[PDB]
């Protein structure tokens, strides 16, 4: 069903969605703490190269060919790792340095908001630059899909805790007769403001009663919230935006991938037919084949000109065989 141009278009949408995800993720301190831990665990053999990066994709990128399953003369997983390790460590190293630089301005920005003011125009432009170069760099690292998904999960988890704390504040305000709209307009954007409770008092008797009579709960929740802002190295409203950014990119990538899998079902089937009596049901063969297809999609590099279906066949086949 897909032309070569359709295959490319899908690859590009996946890559763009992924980039949007990374773009959002790189604003959070946690994503780079995670990458620092992975650097650590690699350096000490706690984890293997293959769990951090897309091993076959990276190795294929050495000669600009198609990614293929690891091993009769082809390279084993250990072989690929041996070829790639030094370069991956070098990149993680360079990135560590750029993260430190970036995190200094993160702390500057969060602290600045905590005092009420904002980053100097220079410190801010520097922030922008660092962000850009870091996103590009991380792109050259070719992270494992599971690692990116782990980052996304962590980000969203934080967001769930935030939404909980805001829910509490919301009903609290409600009991003093402050509507959702009234509250959210008074609250969005000022989550780090130290003089918030004193400033909202000026909004009248309901607000005054709210933050004086129930000052305890209020200051507690706002403390917890502020702790999220600390745990992620960004102000709360920024975190809101990051989360939406990542969700958007994620949905684009997911949809593009889905389209690609659907469009290559026929291929999957035609491979499943060759493995009918080998112990598994036809539908099982299909689903496994699809796991393999999805892997081919994850590792597909359109820029290198190789035909998608014949490449995908290796991964489909590997998934089927392994299940058997």
């Amino acid at each position: 069903l897909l032309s070569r141009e359709g295959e490319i278009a899908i690859a590009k949408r996946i890559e763009a969605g992924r980039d949007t995800m990374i773009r959002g993720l790189c604003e959070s301190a946690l994503t780079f703490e995670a990458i620092m831990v992975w650097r650590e665990e690699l350096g000490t053999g706690r984890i293997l190269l293959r769990e951090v990066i897309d091993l076959e994709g990276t190795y294929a990128a050495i000669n600009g060919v198609a990614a293929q399953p690891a091993a009769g003369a082809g390279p084993t997983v250990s072989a690929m790792e041996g070829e790639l390790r030094e370069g991956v460590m070098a990149i993680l190293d360079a990135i560590a340095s750029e993260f430190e630089a970036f995190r200094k301005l993160q702390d500057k920005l969060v602290g600045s908001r905590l005092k009420g003011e904002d980053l100097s125009d220079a410190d801010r432009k520097a922030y922008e630059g660092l962000s850009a170069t870091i996103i590009q760099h991380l792109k050259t690292l070719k992270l494992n899909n599971n690692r990116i998904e782990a980052l996304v999960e962590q980000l969203y988890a934080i967001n769930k805790r935030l939404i909980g704390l805001e829910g509490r504040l919301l009903r609290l305000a409600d009991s003093y007769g402050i509507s959702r709209g009234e509250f959210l307009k008074a609250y969005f954007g000022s989550e780090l403001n130290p003089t918030w409770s004193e400033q909202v008092k000026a909004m009248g008797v309901r607000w005054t009663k709210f933050v004086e009579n129930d000052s305890q709960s209020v200051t507690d929740i706002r403390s917890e919230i502020a702790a999220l802002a600390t745990e992620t190295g960004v102000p709360i409203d920024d975190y809101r935006r990051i989360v939406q950014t990542v969700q958007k990119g994620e949905r684009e990538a997911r949809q593009a991938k889905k389209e690609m899998v659907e469009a290559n079902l026929r291929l999957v089937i035609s491979i499943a037919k060759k493995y009918t009596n080998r112990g598994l049901q036809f539908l099982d063969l299909i689903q496994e084949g699809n796991i393999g297809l999805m892997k081919a999609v994850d590792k597909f590099e359109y820029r290198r000109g190789y035909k998608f279906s014949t490449y995908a066949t290796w991964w489909i086949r590997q998934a089927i065989t392994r299940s058997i």
């Binding site: 278009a9 949408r13 763009a16 792109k139 958007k248």
Partner: protein, 48 residues
């Protein structure tokens, strides 16, 4: 050079990518989509 980025890419808008995703000037077509991710023109390019 279309009228959308990933962020601004609304629904029923054409998801046809223009340029290199690594490029700062990367865009999507973003014209009215019809039965799928793509306008008729880009659907034609994308399929068969």
């Amino acid at each position: 050079p279309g009228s959308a980025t990933v962020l601004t890419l609304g629904a029923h808008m054409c998801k046809w990518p223009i340029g290199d995703p690594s490029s700062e000037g990367f865009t999507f077509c973003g014209r009215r989509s019809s039965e799928g991710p793509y306008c008729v023109e880009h659907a034609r390019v994308a399929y068969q």
